[PDB]
């Protein structure tokens, strides 16, 4: 009940509505049928202040949806650097692997977020991680023409 309202408000980036819903007992770990939580939604859409509130109410920083994606995956893919840092500070698994073996580092390398790549590496990201297809973040950076990222990954490997 409050769960969908929370997901909707969190998705729409409505800080005050989220705070009201939480203060009135909404389940911080509510999720839709696909395992998508308010923390996922705020991580993908870039709503930093809402991420902060959810974590304060004990949101599972490592919640995994139906596809194996965590909020750190979402933030790395959407390219939200400050949210990536906040998730990591709250214990997000830097090497979480989704159902096709993509890690947040894979997502950042593919989408071209160099600063997020740097942050992930500094927080222990596995440069050698192979997804289900046997590809590393380096491979993805090469495939998508992200040369500076490819150079950083190649140097980090050894």
């Amino acid at each position: 009940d409050l769960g969908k309202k929370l997901l909707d408000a969190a998705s729409a980036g409505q800080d005050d509505e989220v705070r009201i819903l939480m203060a009135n007992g909404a389940d911080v770990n509510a999720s839709n049928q696909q395992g998508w939580t308010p923390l996922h939604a705020t991580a993908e859409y870039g709503h930093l202040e809402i991420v902060d509130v959810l974590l304060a109410y004990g949101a599972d920083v490592n919640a995994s949806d139906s596809y194996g994606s965590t909020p750190l995956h979402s933030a790395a893919w959407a390219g939200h650097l400050e949210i990536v840092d906040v998730l990591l500070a709250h214990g997000a698994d830097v090497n979480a692997s989704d159902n096709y073996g993509w890690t947040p580092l894979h997502l950042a390398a593919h989408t071209g977020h160099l600063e997020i790549v740097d942050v992930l590496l500094a927080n222990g990201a596995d440069v050698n991680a192979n997804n289900w297809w046997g590809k590393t973040p380096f491979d993805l950076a090469i495939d998508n023409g992200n040369e500076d990222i490819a150079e950083v990954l190649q140097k980090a490997a050894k």
Binding site: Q34, Y67, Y100, W132, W133, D143, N144, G145
Partner: protein, 143 residues
């Protein structure tokens, strides 16, 4: 649903879904921005992922990039995948699709997946979804 008449889907993974999202084009092509295509790409990402595909999106690809991506995909090991999908979002004309820098024949893109050229997808469905003009005719409709 009598199983003898359905593709076998008892594989480790459904398979890869490649999306080519061409929005911005080189001034030489004289083609305009494709406003709305990002909404298409994100919608398709979510719905193909829901089906079970590993969806990967590449933006504003040159003809050479499109060719190399599909060629690469055809050379990967799909042994433990049930099928393959590719979605092309671009400008087009009859039998061709636009890369960022010009036109490439659609048949050149699909050719890599021919049964003799892509053995690990043999007897498995190969799906191509193509959002592109195929000419300039308009359908006036009828009541």
């Amino acid at each position: 649903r009598v199983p003898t008449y359905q593709y076998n889907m008892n594989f480790e993974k459904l398979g890869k879904c490649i999306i080519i999202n061409n929005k911005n084009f080189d001034k030489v092509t004289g083609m305009g921005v494709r406003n709305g295509t990002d909404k298409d790409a994100e919608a398709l990402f979510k719905c193909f992922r829901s089906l079970g595909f590993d969806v990967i999106v590449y933006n504003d690809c040159s003809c050479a990039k499109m060719q190399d991506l599909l060629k690469k995909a055809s050379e990967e090991d799909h042994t433990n995948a049930a099928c393959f999908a590719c979605i092309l979002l671009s400008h087009g004309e009859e039998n061709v699709i636009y890369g960022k820098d010009g036109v490439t024949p659609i048949k050149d893109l699909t050719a890599h997946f021919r049964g003799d050229r892509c053995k690990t997808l043999l007897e498995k469905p190969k799906l191509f979804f193509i959002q592109a003009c195929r000419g300039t005719e308009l359908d006036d409709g009828i009541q």
